[PDB]
């Protein structure tokens, strides 16, 4: 149904300015409840996702005349701050309609600037840009969260060089010395907006945001992340890396010198080595518990779904899994079992492997490790199916071809054919067996199909994939550093506010009211002509 | 500090030829000791890396 589709709505929709003017002059109302099921969101089905307000239609259709006309109605003035069923205003509508293209970006940027300045001039006391929708998002936060990179890029650095309008600007150029220009960015609600800052929503997205990788490349955010890196996060991160390395060393030493008797636990003696060993064990288990609770805290503060859990946040999953293995080892240690060694070694191997987590923060090593992670996930799921089909087929063929009253098992034959991958195949591992010619034909066919053709194809395809991820690796590394910075500043372990940029600097000194304004401006020096 | 940043430096810096001609005819000196800590080199801090001479500004 098309509930609320009044004549004014249709006149605007059809781009008939004459009808719009006549209906408005005749007293047609603006606050139309265009709440029909057609006019709701979910554009996948037939519908109109940016309705529920004729101002939203007037702005979204790129017609300046209509929106400029509704500023001063003859009968009933329009209100820009009018909210639809989900709290969205005209600005939220302008954000939502974007598709991240150059022409659409131009149109949406133009309309956004014009509508915002007109609303400010009509109502200087009302800060339209700060109004939140039902989800608690400003249009800036909505653009950042939803994936509208173009509008975000505009908003973060818009400026107006006019009197009584510059106080609405984000970017300023207050000082210049010949070719040198000292730009300022207010950057409110980027470091913190008390609920959801721009960095928080970009970094901790659900992984469905198409541009979560590209948003952090913009002018102010990249410099902010670099500044926070250089300020205090670099030291804390390297310190954590050092502590983790010491933890792994202690764990390895504890594991290597474990006792060799049966049926734990094992009691301390009057010697000295046992005290070092049990100290190492206690420190290891303490580390395991710490990572256990870190994993839980990560989960609870995010609650991602299956479609987001196993496609993102691999490092937290791996550290948590390490913790699980160590705790199972503890349980078995006290449960009078030998099998604690198995879980302990799996934990140890995973801990040393997870040492690669810290390559983030180092440029070249981090890019390298990201490429490895992506070329594991993309390649094993494609390769191992093909390889295992070949291996299993020829293993069953050979093992069922040979039999006597030693290689009568599918396990051993699977192993002997696996060896051909690592350059230790024999080509003769049985003798006097029936159908020698068939056996040789099968092995040679296996070797040609797998060793000579398949592995070389793996190398070639990995080459292609490498060629196609030079840039995605850089973006992902920057994102990983962003996650590290945000987590470190969010916790910080001291309950201190070190995330501030420059203090309450007197950026503007003017508002519509006769007052000054301090806006936490961050300075950037550039040189140009 | 901006030691020696006389009006001639500012007229040249702003590319205002009228002020340059007026100041020169009025007797503004050329060999200005524009040795201000800002106006000298050391680009790493805020500064002006091609100062200490108004002819350097002119060029
Ligand atoms: C019995 C013995 C078994 C040993 C098993 C060993 C496995 C390999 C060990 C791999 C070592 C590296 C590592 O452990 O770290 C890698 C994860 O590698 C894997 O994928 C392992 C697949 C399996 C990065 O982890 P991260 O959580 O940073 O993922 C990034 C997100 O953060 C971010 O939001 C972005 O979404 C970004 O696109 C993501 O990449």
Swiss-Prot record, chain A:
Residue list for modification Phosphothreonine: 173, 484
Placement of sequence motif Selectivity filter: 423-426
Subcellular location: Postsynaptic cell membrane; Cell projection, Dendritic spine membrane; Cell membrane
Residues engaged in binding resiniferatoxin: 314-315, 353, 360
Entry binding sites for Ca(2+): 426
Repeat positions for ANK: 6-31, 52-79, 88-124, 138-161, 196-218
Reported regulation of activity: Channel activity is activated via the interaction with PIRT and phosphatidylinositol 4,5-bisphosphate (PIP2). Both PIRT and PIP2 are required to activate channel activity. The channel is sensitized by ATP binding. Repeated stimulation with capsaicin gives rise to progressively smaller responses, due to desensitization. This desensitization is triggered by the influx of calcium ions and is inhibited by elevated ATP levels. Ca(2+) and CALM displace ATP from its binding site and trigger a conformation change that leads to a closed, desensitized channel.
Binding site for Na(+) 1: 423
A single Gene Ontology CC term: postsynaptic membrane
GO MF annotations in UniProt: ATP binding; calcium channel activity; calmodulin binding; chloride channel regulator activity; excitatory extracellular ligand-gated monoatomic ion channel activity; extracellular ligand-gated monoatomic ion channel activity; identical protein binding; intracellularly gated calcium channel activity
Outcome following mutation: residue 5 to A: Strongly reduces affinity for ATP
UniProt keyword list: ANK repeat, ATP-binding, Calcium, Calcium channel, Calcium transport, Calmodulin-binding, Cell membrane, Cell projection, Glycoprotein, Ion channel, Ion transport, Lipid-binding, Membrane, Metal-binding, Nucleotide-binding, Phosphoprotein, Postsynaptic cell membrane, Repeat, Sodium, Synapse, Transmembrane, Transmembrane helix, Transport
Residue numbers bearing the Phosphoserine modification: 305
Effect of residue 428 to Q: Minor modification of pore attributes
Extracellular side, ranges: 257-274, 335-338, 430-437
Transmembrane segments annotated in the record for this chain: 236-256, 275-300, 314-334, 339-359, 375-402, 438-466
Domain of life (superkingdom): Eukaryota
Gene Ontology biological process terms from the UniProt entry: behavioral response to pain; calcium ion import across plasma membrane; calcium ion transmembrane transport; calcium ion transport; cellular response to acidic pH; cellular response to alkaloid; cellular response to ATP; cellular response to cytokine stimulus
Outcome following mutation: residue 416 to Q: Slight modification of pore attributes
Family of the protein in this entry: Belongs to the transient receptor (TC 1.A.4) family. TrpV subfamily. TRPV1 sub-subfamily.
Further information: Responses evoked by capsaicin, but not by low pH and heat, can be antagonized by capsazepine.
Function of the molecule: Non-selective calcium permeant cation channel involved in detection of noxious chemical and thermal stimuli. Seems to mediate proton influx and may be involved in intracellular acidosis in nociceptive neurons. Involved in mediation of inflammatory pain and hyperalgesia. Sensitized by a phosphatidylinositol second messenger system activated by receptor tyrosine kinases, which involves PKC isozymes and PCL. Activation by vanilloids, like capsaicin, and temperatures higher than 42 degrees Celsius.
Record's protein name: Transient receptor potential cation channel subfamily V member 1
Species name: Rattus norvegicus (Rat)
């Amino acid at each position: 149904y098309y509930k609320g589709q009044t004549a004014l709505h249709i006149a605007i929709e059809r781009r008939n300015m004459t009808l719009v003017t006549l209906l408005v002059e005749n007293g047609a109302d603006v606050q139309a409840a265009a709440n029909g099921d057609f006019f709701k969101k979910t554009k996948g089905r037939p519908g109109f996702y940016f309705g529920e307000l004729p101002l939203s239609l007037a702005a979204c259709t790129n017609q300046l005349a209509i929106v400029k006309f509704l500023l001063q109605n003859s009968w009933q003035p329009a209100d820009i701050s009018a909210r639809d069923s989900v709290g969205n205003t005209v600005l939220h509508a302008l954000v939502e309609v974007a598709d991240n293209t150059v022409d659409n970006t131009k149109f949406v940027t133009s309309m956004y600037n014009e509508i915002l300045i007109l609303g400010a001039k009509l109502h200087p006391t009302l800060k339209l840009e700060e109004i939140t929708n039902r989800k608690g998002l400003t249009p800036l936060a909505l653009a950042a969260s939803s994936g509208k990179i173009g509008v975000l890029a505009y908003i973060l650095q818009r400026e107006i060089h006019e009197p009584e309008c510059r106080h609405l600007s984000r970017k300023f150029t207050e000082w210049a010395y010949g070719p040198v220009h000292s730009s300022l960015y207010d950057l409110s609600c980027i470091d913190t907006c008390e609920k959801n800052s721009v960095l928080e929503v970009i970094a901790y997205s659900s992984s469905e945001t198409p541009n979560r990788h590209d948003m952090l490349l913009v002018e102010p955010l990249n410099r902010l992340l670099q500044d926070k890196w250089d300020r205090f996060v670099k030291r804390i991160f390297y310190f954590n890396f050092f502590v983790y390395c010491l933890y792994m060393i202690i764990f390895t030493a504890a594991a290597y010198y474990r006792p060799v008797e049966g049926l734990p636990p094992y009691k301390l003696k009057n010697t000295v080595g046992d005290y070092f060993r049990v100290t190492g064990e206690i420190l290891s288990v303490s580390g395991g518990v710490y990572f256990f609770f870190r994993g839980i805290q990560y989960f609870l503060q995010r609650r991602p779904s299956l479609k987001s859990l196993f496609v993102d946040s691999y490092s937290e999953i791996l550290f948590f899994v390490q913790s699980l293995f160590m705790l199972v080892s503890v349980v078995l240690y006290f449960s009078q079992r030998k099998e604690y060694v198995a879980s302990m070694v799996f934990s140890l191997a995973m801990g040393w492997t997870n040492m690669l987590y810290y390559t983030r923060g180092f440029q070249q090593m981090g890019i390298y490790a990201v490429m490895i992670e992506k070329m594991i996930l993309r390649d094993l799921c494609r390769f191992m199916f093909v390889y295992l089909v070949f291996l299993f087929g020829f293993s069953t063929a050979v093992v069922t071809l040979i039999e006597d009253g030693s290689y009568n098992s599918l396990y051993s034959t699977c192993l002997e054919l696996f060896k051909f991958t690592i350059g230790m195949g024999d080509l003769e591992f049985t003798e006097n067996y029936d159908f020698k010619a068939v056996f040789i034909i099968l092995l040679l066919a296996y070797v040609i199909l797998t060793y000579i053709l398949l592995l070389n194809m793996l190398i070639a395809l990995m080459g292609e994939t490498v060629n196609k991820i030079a840039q995605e690796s850089k973006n992902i590394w920057k994102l990983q550093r962003a996650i590290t910075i945000l987590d470190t500043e969010k916790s910080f372990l001291k309950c201190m506010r070190k995330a501030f940029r420059s203090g309450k600097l007197l950026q503007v000194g003017f508002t519509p009211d006769g007052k000054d304004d301090y806006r936490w401006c961050f300075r950037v020096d550039e040189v140009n002509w």
